Amino acid sequence: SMMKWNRERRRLQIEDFEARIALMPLLQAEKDRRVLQMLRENLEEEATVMKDVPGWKVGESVFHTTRWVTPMMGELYGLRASEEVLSATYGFIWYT
Amino acid sequence: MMLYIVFILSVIFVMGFVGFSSKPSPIYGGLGLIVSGGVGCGIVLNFGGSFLGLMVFLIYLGGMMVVFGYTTAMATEQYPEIWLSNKAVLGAFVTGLLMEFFMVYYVLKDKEVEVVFEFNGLGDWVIYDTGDSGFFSEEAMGIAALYSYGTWLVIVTGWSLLIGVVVIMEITRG
Amino acid sequence: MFMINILMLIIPILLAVAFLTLVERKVLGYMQLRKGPNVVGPYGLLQPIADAIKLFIKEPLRPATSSASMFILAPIMALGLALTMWIPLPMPYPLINMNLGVLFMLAMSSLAVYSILWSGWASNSKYALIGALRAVAQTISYEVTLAIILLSVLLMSGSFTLSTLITTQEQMWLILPAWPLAMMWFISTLAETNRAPFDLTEGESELVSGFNVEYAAGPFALFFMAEYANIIMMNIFTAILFLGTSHNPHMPELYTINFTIKSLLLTMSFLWIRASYPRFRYDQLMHLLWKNFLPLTLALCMWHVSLPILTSGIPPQT
Amino acid sequence: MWFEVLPGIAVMGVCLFIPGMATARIHRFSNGGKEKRVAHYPYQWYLMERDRRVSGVNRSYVSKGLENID
Amino acid sequence: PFFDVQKRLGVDLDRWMTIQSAEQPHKIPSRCHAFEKEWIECAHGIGSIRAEKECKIEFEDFRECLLRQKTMKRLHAIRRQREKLIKEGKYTPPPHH
Amino acid sequence: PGIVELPSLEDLKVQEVKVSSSVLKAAAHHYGAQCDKPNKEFMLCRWEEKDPRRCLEEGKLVNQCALEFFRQIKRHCAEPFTEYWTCIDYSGLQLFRRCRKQQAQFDECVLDKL
Amino acid sequence: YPTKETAHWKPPPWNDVDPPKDTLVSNLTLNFGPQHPAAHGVLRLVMELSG
Amino acid sequence: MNLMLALLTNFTLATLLVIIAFWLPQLNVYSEKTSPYECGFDPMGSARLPFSMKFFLVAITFLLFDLEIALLLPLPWASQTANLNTMLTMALFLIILLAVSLAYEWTQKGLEWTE
Amino acid sequence: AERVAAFLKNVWAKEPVLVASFAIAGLAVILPTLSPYTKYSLMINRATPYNYPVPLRDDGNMPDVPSHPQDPQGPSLEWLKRL
Amino acid sequence: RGEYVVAKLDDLINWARRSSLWPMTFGLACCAVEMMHMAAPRYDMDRFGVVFRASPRQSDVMIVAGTLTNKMAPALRKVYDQMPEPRYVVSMGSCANGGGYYHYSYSVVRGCDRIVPVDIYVPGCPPTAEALLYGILQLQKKIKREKRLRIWYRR
Amino acid sequence: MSMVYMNIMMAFTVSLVGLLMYRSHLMSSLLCLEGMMLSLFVMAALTILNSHFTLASMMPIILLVFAACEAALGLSLLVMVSNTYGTDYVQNLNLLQC
Ligand SMILES: CCCCCCCCCCCCO[C@@H]1O[C@H](CO)[C@@H](O[C@H]2O[C@H](CO)[C@@H](O)[C@H](O)[C@H]2O)[C@H](O)[C@H]1O
C-alpha cells in the first residue's frame, strides 16, 4: 500500500513542480525589474545625500570587472525602513 | 533591535564560552557549554542552517550528559567551585566579560571596531543573499549529497568511528 | 492574535494534565479492585484542584546544602520545556510549522533530561544524586534506538516535517508497514518518559522519590506537571507517527476528534502498563535497549533504506 | 463501577480537543477564512511575499483575481 | 598532494569539493561562482609566482565578492552621512525609504 | 572602477500582472502551453546574457503575453476559472490534489471556448 | 649534571612500572531506612556502595 | 518572533508559578528543617564525594553511536538522488559498519558493567 | 551441511532476536539486486524537475529537441503514469 | 466586606488541605498492617484523596503506627522536622499513644507526644482499619475548623 | 569582516586561552577542547551557508564526527588517569619529568 501511495505522491510532486516551471519566466521578469527599480531609487536618493562630500563618486562600483554582480541585501535594501529589511532578510526563516 | 538578532546571539555565544573557559566545576562548565551550543544553533539557524543548527545542538546535548555522568564519578570535590567562589575563576570570568563588553560598546557606537582586525558593525543582514526560490534547502542538498558524492568521506569517517570503538576498549581495559 | 493562540494551547494542556492525575488514580484503582478518588467532588472531579491548590500554599523547603540558583532553575526548565514540545504538533494545524519538526522534538527531549540531572545535583543529597545518575544511564539506553527508529519511519514519509506524516498515512496507518518499529517505539517512549516499568529515576521502592526527593510544594508540582505533560505529548506524537488520522481541510474538527481519541487510548495504555508489570533494574534497561532493540533497530534501518528503492516507492521530498 | 471513570476522561478529552480546534479557528480567522499559507521552501515565500504586494493592502491572504487585471 | 595518486589512478577521491565552482547537486550555483571561475581560468597553468602578480585583478574581485569589505565601507559611508544630515534636519527621505 | 550602468525608471515601467498566487498556479499548465514562445525566448536570453539590464525588452514581451492569456480567460469562461482558483486559494499548500472536481470544469471549458 | 633543582630526582623503575598507590578509594556510605518503604520502617541498613 | 514568543511565554509561566510558589506560602525555616534528607539519620559524608561509574565504557561508546545517527539523518533526503546506486551501497555500509562496531563491543564483554 | 542447519536451531533457541535481525539485514542487502523495480527508482528520481529546463538555441541541426513542450519529441513519462 | 473575603479564602485553603492529605509512608510495627488495610480495597483511603508519599518533603501527615523505641526517637523527630508546614501527626495505636504494652520498658518512649506534637489519638491495639479511617476523617474535620486567615485579618 | 565573525573568533580565542591555562581538573580542560570545535563548527557553517557553497554543507557534519572522537578519546584517558590517582588532577601527572 505504501508502494502505490508513494508512487502516486511522486506523480503529484511532478505536477506541482511543472506548474512552477511554467510561472518561473514570469517571476523572473518581475524580479529583474524589481531589482533594477530598487537600485535606481537608491542611487537617486544617494547622490543627494552625499552631494557635499569630497571624493565621492555616486554609483561607483567596487568591482573592477564591468560584469553584472547580483546585489547583496545591504546594497539593495540599504536605505529602507527596518520593516522591509527584516521581512526581506529573516522573514522566511522566521515564518512560523 | 531585531535586525541584530545574529549579533545578540553571538554575544551570548561568547558569554557562554567565558563561563566554561574560566573553568569552574565541570558541572557549571557543561552548563555554559549547553548555552553556547544552543545559541550556536540560533546563529547557524538564522543563516539557513536549520539542519546544521539542530545537529550541533542535539549532538552536544548528549555529549555533556556523559560529561555530567563522568564529572560526578571523577572530577568532583567536596566544594564544587562556581564563578564567585575562587579568585582565579572570578578573575577569568570578569576579565572575559569586560573584554567582551568593550567590544560590544565600541562596535555598536562607532558601527565598526578594530580589535586587531577590521570588523564592520552595520549588521549581519547586509551580506545575505537577496534572491532565491527553489523547492529545496540548498543546505539539505549539500548534506544529502554526502552519499552520492562523498563516498571517500563516508569510508574514512565510518572507518574512524569503528577504530574509535576498538581504541576505547583497549585504552580502558588495562 | 498569536499570543491568544499560545494561551489556548498552554491552558488546556495544564487542565488536561491536572485531570490525567485523576484518570490515572481512578484507572489504577479499578484495576486494583478499589475506586480511586470519588469524594472530593462528583466522581472526584475536583480532586485535581485540591491537589494543585494544596501544593502552592505549602512552604517550599530549600535544602541547606542545595545550590540555590540551579536548584530553582531545574523545575522551571522542566515545565518550560514540557510545554515547548507541543508547539510543533499538528492537530491538524501546528502552532509553529517546522520543516524539521521531528529533530526539534528529539532536541527538546534531550535538553529536558537536564532538568533531572541538575535538580538531583542541586539537591546535594545522596538519594537525589543516585536518582540523578539513573537518568544518565537511562538516556544512554534509549536515545540511539529512539533516533534510529524514528529515522526508519521517516524513510517512508520522506521528510522531517510532522504535518507530512499526515499526508503519508492517508491510505493506511503506518502500524501496518512498521509494526516492528511501532513495538519498539512504544517501549522507548516509556523509557523516555520515565514511566513504569522504566520508572528508575524516581524508583520509590528504591530511592524514596529519587532525583526530586528534596523538592516540596510548588517546585515539586512543576516536576509533577512536567512529567504528565510529556506522557500526553509522547502519545500524541505516537498517534501521529503510526496511527495517522485523515485530515479534511473543510471540516478540520473531525481530525481533532479522532485524533484526541487515539491519544487517550494510548495515554491509557501507559496507565494500564503501570498496573501490570514490575520494575526493570536500571542495568537491565541498557541490555534490553542495546542487546535486543538496537540490533533489530539497525537491521530494520537497512531494511527501510532498501525497501523504497527495490519497490520504486520512494516518497517525495515535498 | 468502571463507567465512573468516564467523567474524568471526558473532561480530559475536551481539554485535549481545544488546542487543535483553537488553532484551526484562529488561523482561519486571521487569514480571511483560509488556511494559513505554508512556506517550507524559499519558493513559496516568494509567492507569499508577492501576494502581499499584489494585494495592495499589505496582506498576503487577500487574493486578487481576474477582476484585478487591466 | 604529496603523492599525487589521484591523478595517476584517475579516481576523484576529494577534488570534487576543493573549489566552489565545481559540479554541485542540482546545479545550485555558488554566490561568487563567476568571480571564482574567472580567477581560476586566468591563473590556470601559469603558476602561483606569476598568478600572484598577473591575475591580481581577478583575485581582488574574488576577494571582494567573498568578504564584501569594500562594499560595506561604501554602505557605511552613506549611512554615516545620511544619519548626519537627518540629525541636522537637512535631508528628507522619500516615502519609499 | 566605473559607474554601475543602470536603466532609467521610465524603461523599467510595464503593465504588471496583478493576480495573486493561487490565480497563477491554477492557470499554470495552460499558461505553459500558450505563452511558451516569449517565455522561452526571454529565459534563453537570461542565461545567455547573465545580465538583467540586457534582457529587458524580452522581459516586457513576457508580461504582455501573460496579460493576453488572462484576458482570453476573462472574455470567455472566467466563472469556471474563479470557481477553480478559489479552491486552490483555500488550501494552505495550494494543492492541485484537493480540487480535481472544480478543475475539470475549468479544463473542459477552455477545451471548448478556446 | 646534578643541581639543586634536580637534587631529588630519582632514577625511574627498571621495568617502568611505578608502584601502585594505596589510595583509599572509599565507598559511599548510605542510610537505607529506617524511614524507607523498602526498609519495613525500622531497619537502618548502612551500605558501602561503589556506584 | 512567533517561535521566540512561544518560548518566552512557556518559560515565563514556569517562572511565575515558581515565584508564586516561593512568596505565597507562610514560611517557617529553622536549622533542622532544611538539613539534608537521608531516612531520618544524619548523612555520612558528602553527597559531593565521588560516585563510581560502572557503565563508564558504554557511556563513551554512546558518544560515538550518537554521532552515527547524525550521519544517517540525511538518509531521507539522500534517497531523492538520481545516483541511487552509490547512495544505497554507502548507506548500507555505514549501518553495517555500525553493526560491526556493536558486535565487537558486545562480544569483547564491553557492554557488561564492571564489578 | 547439517552442522549449520543445527547451528540455526540452537541460536533460534537461545537468541531469536539476533536470528531475526540478521535475516532482515540479509534481505536489505540482497533483494535490491533481485527486483524488476529497482531500475525505476533511478528513473523517477531523475524525472523530478528541480531547476528550470533551460532552452537551447535552435541552429537547424538538432531535430531531436522539441520546439514546444507539447511536441512529440523529448522523453515521455507515460511509463510513470501507468506504473 | 473584608471579613467575608477571608472567610471564603479560608474555607478554600482548608478545603484544599483536608481534601488532599498525603501521609508519609512510615509504619513502625504491628499498626502498620492495619494502615495497609486502610489502603486496601475494602476501605480505599485513596478515594478520600489520601495518597502515601515516601519523601517527608512531599508529605502532609505523619501517622505514628507502632512502638517508638529510644533508638527510633531521633529519627522520628528528624523526618517530622523535614515536613513542610502545615504538618499534622496522627498517633495510631497504644504504643504510639502512650507506650501501650511496653510502657514500663527501658527502651520505649512513653507516647510519641514526648517527641512530636500530636493532633489525633486513635486508640486500639491495633485500631481496626475502620478505626484509623475514623481518625483520619476526624483530622479532616479539624482542618475544616482552622481559621488562619480570619485570625490574620484581626491581628 | 561581518560583525558576526568578531564574536565567533572571539569565542575561539577565549576557548584557546582557556585550554592553554590549566587549573586543576583535567575534565575542565577537555571541555575547553569541546568549546573550540563548537566555535569552529559555527564559524565554518556561517561561511559555507553564506557563500551558498552547497557541497561543503557536509563539512561541519564531518567536523563533529571527529570532534566526539577526541571527546571519547579524552574521556578514555581521563578514566585511566582517575583510576591511578583517584582524581583527574593534572598536578599528579608529573612522573615523566625525570
Ligand atoms: C564491511 C563492509 C560491508 C559493506 C557492505 C555493502 C553492501 C552493499 C551491497 C550492494 C547494495 C546495492 O546494490 C546495488 O543497488 C543497485 C541500485 O541501488 C541495484 O540495482 C541497479 O542495478 C543495475 C545497475 O546498472 C540497474 O538495473 C539499475 O541501475 C539498478 O536496478 C544493483 O542491482 C545492486 O548492485
Ligand code: SF4
Ligand atoms: S499499639 Fe498494638 S498493634 Fe500497634 S504496635 Fe503496639 S502492640 Fe502492635
